Design a binder for this molecule. Sequence first.
Ligand SMILES: *[C@@H]1O[C@H](CO)[C@@H](O[C@@H]2O[C@H](CO)[C@@H](O[C@@H]3O[C@H](CO[C@H]4O[C@H](CO)[C@@H](O)[C@H](O[C@H]5O[C@H](CO)[C@@H](O)[C@H](O)[C@@H]5O[C@H]5O[C@H](CO)[C@@H](O)[C@H](O)[C@@H]5O)[C@@H]4O)[C@@H](O)[C@H](O)[C@@H]3O)[C@H](O)[C@H]2NC(C)=O)[C@H](O)[C@H]1NC(C)=O
Ligand code: YGB
Ligand code: CA
Ligand code: CL
Ligand code: CL
Ligand code: ZN
Ligand code: ZN
Length: 806
Amino acid sequence: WTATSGSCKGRCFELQEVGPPDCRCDNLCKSYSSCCHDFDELCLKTARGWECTKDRCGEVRNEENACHCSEDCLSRGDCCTNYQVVCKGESHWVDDDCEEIKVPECPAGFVRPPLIIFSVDGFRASYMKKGSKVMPNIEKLRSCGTHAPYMRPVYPTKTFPNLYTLATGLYPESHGIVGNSMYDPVFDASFHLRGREKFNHRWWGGQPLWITATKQGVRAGTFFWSVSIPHERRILTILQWLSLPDNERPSVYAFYSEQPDFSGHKYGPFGPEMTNPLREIDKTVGQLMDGLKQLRLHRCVNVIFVGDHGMEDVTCDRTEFLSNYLTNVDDITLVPGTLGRIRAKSINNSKYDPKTIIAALTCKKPDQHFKPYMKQHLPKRLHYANNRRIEDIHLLVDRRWHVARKPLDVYKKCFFQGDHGFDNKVNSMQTVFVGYGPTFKYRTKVPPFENIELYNVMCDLLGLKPAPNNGTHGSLNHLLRTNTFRPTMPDEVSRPNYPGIMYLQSEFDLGCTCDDKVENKLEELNKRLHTKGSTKERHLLYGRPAVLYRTSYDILYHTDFESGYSEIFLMPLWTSYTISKQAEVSSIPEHLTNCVRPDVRVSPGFSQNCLAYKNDKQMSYGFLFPPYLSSSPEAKYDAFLVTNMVPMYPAFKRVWAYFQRVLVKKYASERNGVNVISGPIFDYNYDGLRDTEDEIKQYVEGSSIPVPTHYYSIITSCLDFTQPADKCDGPLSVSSFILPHRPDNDESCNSSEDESKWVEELMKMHTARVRDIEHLTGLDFYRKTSRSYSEILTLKTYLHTYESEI
Ligand SMILES: *[C@@H]1O[C@H](CO)[C@@H](O[C@@H]2O[C@H](CO)[C@@H](O[C@@H]3O[C@H](CO[C@H]4O[C@H](CO)[C@@H](O)[C@H](O[C@H]5O[C@H](CO)[C@@H](O)[C@H](O)[C@@H]5O[C@H]5O[C@H](CO)[C@@H](O)[C@H](O)[C@@H]5O)[C@@H]4O)[C@@H](O)[C@H](O)[C@@H]3O)[C@H](O)[C@H]2NC(C)=O)[C@H](O)[C@H]1NC(C)=O
Ligand SMILES: O=C(NCc1cnn[nH]1)[C@H]1C[C@@H]2CN(C(=O)OCc3cc(Cl)cc(Cl)c3)C[C@@H]2C1
Ligand SMILES: [Ca+2]
Ligand SMILES: [Cl-]
Ligand SMILES: [Cl-]
Ligand SMILES: [Zn+2]
Ligand SMILES: [Zn+2]
């Protein structure tokens, strides 16, 4: 109940929220059914439309009009946006040539340049080029301001998860809005696009920009607009708020368009009916920019034009049904669509086995247009596991397809031609970014980035200190004319040991054999130097990674590679090596097939042993630096040191071996040498963060040798490929992966064929940013380069997607 007897007289779109049983006059009141009796009458005028005509010029102020063309409208702060154009012979904003905004041109009383977020739903990245002829206002913003060719959304590529990520800089797994539709098992409740449940505070974690702003003394316009407030009223309300007295006026604003998403669903991303929604958006943009020109704020305000996700061709006939795979289909709940989330229909039923579900959904049809995963095996780049609202069973659906439970769910629950929600690296899902204003750069294109990075920038644009988030602060400094923020490298927490030769062969009882006794002052002082680091500036090109946590570890030097060896985890945390274009692949000779040699620099007690692998019938081992790439038959003995050894499922060895024997060499040819850093990752609790020693869930049987959940590699070269990797003068190029360490190759339906048919494809799927690896290892890479730290931060956030041209 709400005693909605009070009035909105002069209170139209008030900024503070008055609580029950009183009536509200803020743009949220319609959603809570708590508006004052007269809200519509007074606060939602429509009469005479939204534009000034030649006959309205210098009229008599009639307060019933939606907007005004009277002489005092400028002062009242409520002219129609084209007022000055029709009446005072002024031109539209779009018609003026853009002049660089070298400094903020702000009216007296304005303490800082305001920020307006213009968000557009379902604005596919390629609309900027393909609709450019019908979007002149947006095209002016783009070309005069700062733009990316596209901006990467978060997964799932849906509205709620993406808007709240924009507002908070957090992955959905962290902010809690993991879908437009969710079931929380603790609440025993469901969150939907419709309904009032979504209005409970308990769903929304993190700290959104408008709370960040309020808590630091900066006032915000609302970020929630009612469906029945037309877009023209939204612009005018923003312009009214900009006319408020200094101490009442917000510094940050939001506008939201349901278009072009709404039509995209009906007509597909490029349906002929899509031209008009794009015209409308532009018109709205024009109105804002004209309005700001009137209030003399158009060279003062920073405007961000941004979308939440793109749009793909999807139709009903492209539906895979679970009923065609499962017999017991009625014992599951499925969150359907462009992604799939499965859980049991009841918990009172413990006969429910996710293992049988995954098995029944795996490579069962040659054409399968989805792939099942346990959430912990989803590509780490999606960061879509660490929340109780994410069901253990996930289906990644092919672009252009849907998953549903039964046929009845699709005809009784074709009316659509577009959808979104797919894997966030899919081209059709990419959306837009443009920044325009004093604080942004002039006529500047920047490389694509992820939307998790904007919260930091919007905090900078507003002199705010960002709440802790998943952006990398400084990675988008190259967008801005002037920077609030100077990023600095984290300090190293653990310094390495540099052990010498300290142990004799006979002190080791590892159960490891090797045929290596086939034995000159020249070539004996020479290999001492190798063990001292005479070739370190060859294999360690960007300085040692910094260990950002307290631990105990050794640096080990060799002819062909350098490693940071953990005495705790009994394996390297990282292994670094360079393969030049010239370098050659050789094989593991017949007498050295099972060679494992004790490392005389590390004690028996801090070594692995061959015995454990012999007892463990599920677990084999591999090497971080690959024998195949030794520079000499003499150097190859180094690769077999117990300290280069890591536990590997025979199934995983297949992936690893092909990477090491074929792909590294291929990459070195194409990129003119590559530097490779590889290592283990332990993330048993799938929070995307490194696990501590006392969080290890899997050991090699009867040992203290922990079993990695993943194996990473970072592959760096010169961006200018005419220069060798080891003599690069300028910017770097990088690609990385985090491969799940799994006992089977069930993920790859073609894995029974030659590795050259499926391995590279699996690696591509599990592509990664260096930054993701940093979170997972507690390491910090690229500490010693000739490049600026801001540029290195951009490099660290880069993701190689392997998608074709946008
Ligand atoms: C991306 O960036 C974020 C933010 O920096 C990182 O997440 C942070 O990581 C650490 C380590 O896991 C967590 O620290 C723990 O914090 C709790 C106390 O936490 C409470 O207070 C904080 C601060 O005000 C608040 O943010 C927390 O909110 C969580 O819980 C709410 C329910 O009570 C929920 O509504 C909200 O969405 C959020 O849940 C998420 O995080 C929790 C972990 O706390 C997780 O279980 C859940 O599934 C959600 O993902 C909370 O009230 C201490 O008691 C512990 O000792 C410990 O220090 C931070 O809480 C966490 N912050 C946030 C906002 O999630 C991510 O690790 C990073 N990801 C990557 C990949 O780098
Ligand atoms: O259900 C919806 N759309 C569904 C649809 C319609 N047509 N197609 N799909 C709407 C999206 C919501 C947010 N809001 C608002 O105005 O958003 C501004 C904002 C900006 C940022 Cl950057 C961050 C945040 Cl959190 C909010 C009105 C809401 C209801
Ligand atoms: Ca972890
Ligand atoms: Cl969803
Ligand atoms: Cl296999
Ligand atoms: Zn959307
Ligand atoms: Zn949509």
